Design a protein around this ligand. Structure first.
Ligand code: ZN
Ligand code: ZN
Ligand code: ZN
Length: 74
């Protein structure tokens, strides 16, 4: 399946994922794509921020769903 990751930048990134992909996996895919390291990413879906451990299915994220990426730079 496919999901979108819209940036605060504005640009939209599209990812090939699986329903049982962990958020950690999603962060990994974004690093393989945009260079940004996992522990610098925060992911938002329908106003809630996602946990590295739990999966897309758990958050009921199906195809063509949009996730927000916000950077934590510390
Ligand atoms: Zn996967
Ligand atoms: Zn890789
Ligand atoms: Zn949105």
């Amino acid at each position: 399946m496919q999901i979108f990751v819209k940036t605060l930048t504005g640009k939209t990134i599209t990812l090939e994922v699986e329903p049982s992909d962990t958020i950690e996996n999603v962060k990994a895919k974004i690093q393989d794509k945009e260079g940004i390291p996992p522990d610098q990413q925060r992911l938002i879906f329908a106003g809630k921020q996602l946990e590295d451990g739990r999966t897309l299915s758990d958050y009921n994220i199906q195809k063509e769903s949009t996730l927000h990426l916000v950077l934590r730079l510390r």
